């Protein structure tokens, strides 16, 4: 679910408010996304967008009823290390290594203040 | 919570069915608890008891209202061991390790069938 996709990016980033952060920047990250990623930190929430319509695809995941933003699963962050519990189902366990990706891909990339809140009429 | 307790000991014993398996054993393995431990996994108990006492006393602690066995903390399981999420805060944190501790502690000690479900009037 969103809470535990943001402590992850702050296990990763622990100076971070992801939800203010990270909302709305680029093409991708935020709620949907189209067009061409403007930068590395977009293309992380392209694939992540991917990855979140990939699990849709599981017949695990068709049971679900809470979709993905609100489907729990659980996780530690240790050390500013995140792993996935193995008391997740298949489902939870997909939608948790999704998420995990990209938080490891956010701490990687820069991060352009430009890019936020950025016009849509640029996707 | 008693559902992330349920998982710490299958994380660390498999084969079993923790609600089933360890519920009313010994003197302290269950609600409340009073007597002399009758062995070791009921001294498991019987201190896991004694650090749930403790947490009660944590000022932290005394803003939860949701009394230990509701309390949800994170953790998670991963080849067999159990970790104690960094996002707890520090009553769930204080209880996570109570539940660690015992989990571990139950893996190590010999299993008395004749202890299950053992008569009060031994406490
Ligand atoms: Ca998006
Ligand atoms: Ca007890």
Same mark, same amino acid.
């Given at each position: +679910?969103?809470?535990?996709? $943001? !402590?992850? @990016?702050?296990?990763?980033?622990?100076?971070?408010?992801?939800? %203010?952060?990270?909302? $709305?920047?680029?093409?991708?990250?935020? %709620? !949907?996304?189209?067009?061409?990623?403007?930068?590395?930190?977009?293309?992380?929430?392209?694939?992540?967008? $991917?990855?979140?319509?990939?699990?849709?695809? %599981?017949?695990?995941?068709?049971?679900?009823?809470?979709?993905?933003?609100?489907?729990?699963?659980?996780?530690? &962050?240790? #050390?500013?290390?995140?792993?996935?519990?193995?008391?997740? #189902?298949? &489902?939870? +366990?997909? @939608?948790?290594?999704? /998420?995990?990706?990209?938080? @490891?891909?956010?701490?990687?990339?820069?991060? $352009?203040?430009?890019?936020? #809140? %950025? /016009?849509?009429? #640029?996707?």
């Amino acid at each position: +679910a969103l809470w535990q996709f $943001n !402590g992850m @990016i702050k296990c990763k980033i622990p100076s971070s408010e992801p939800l %203010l952060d990270f909302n $709305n920047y680029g093409c991708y990250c935020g %709620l !949907g996304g189209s067009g061409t990623p403007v930068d590395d930190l977009d293309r992380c929430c392209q694939t992540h967008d $991917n990855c979140y319509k990939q699990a849709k695809k %599981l017949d695990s995941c068709k049971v679900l009823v809470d979709n993905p933003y609100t489907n729990n699963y659980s996780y530690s &962050c240790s #050390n500013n290390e995140i792993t996935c519990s193995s008391e997740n #189902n298949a &489902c939870e +366990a997909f @939608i948790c290594n999704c /998420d995990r990706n990209a938080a @490891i891909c956010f701490s990687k990339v820069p991060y $352009n203040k430009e890019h936020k #809140n %950025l /016009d849509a009429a #640029n996707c």
